[PDB]
Amino acid sequence: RVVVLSFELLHAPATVCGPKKSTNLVKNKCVNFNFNGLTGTGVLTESNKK
Amino acid sequence: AYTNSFTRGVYYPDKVFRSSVLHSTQDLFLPFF
Numbered sequence: 001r002v003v004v005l006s007f008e009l010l011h012a013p014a015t016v017c018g019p020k021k022s023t024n025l026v027k028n029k030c031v032n033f034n035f036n037g038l039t040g041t042g043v044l045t046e047s048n049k050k
Numbered sequence: 051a052y053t054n055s056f057t058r059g060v061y062y063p064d065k066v067f068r069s070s071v072l073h074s075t076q077d078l079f080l081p082f083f
C-alpha cells in the first residue's frame with residue numbers, strides 16, 4: 001500500500017500547517033520571523049501596500 | 051466571422067505581489083492582435 005503526498009509549496013494562503021503553535025507579533029523591532037513556514041529575520045512595520 | 055484580439059488573453063502568472071517592476075514569464079498566453 002503506497003500513498004504519495006504531493007505538496008504545493010507556498011504561493012497562496014496556507015491551509016495545511018504543522019502542529020507548531022503560533023506566537024504574538026511584535027512590530028518595529030528586529031525579530032526572527034516565521035510566516036507560514038517562510039523564515040527570515042527583519043523588522044516588521046505597518047505598510048500601505050494592497 | 052472573425053475578429054482581432056485587441057490586447058487580450060493575459061493572466062497573472064502566479065500569486066506573488068510585485069510592484070513597480072517589469073517581470074518576464076514564458077507560459078501559454080493568447081498573443082496580442
Ligand SMILES: *[C@@H]1O[C@H](CO)[C@@H](O)[C@H](O)[C@H]1NC(C)=O
Pocket residue numbers: 051052053054
Ligand atoms: C482573420 O485572419 C485572416 C488571415 O490573417 C484575415 O485574412 C482575415 O481577414 C481575418 N479576419 C477578419 C475578420 O479580418
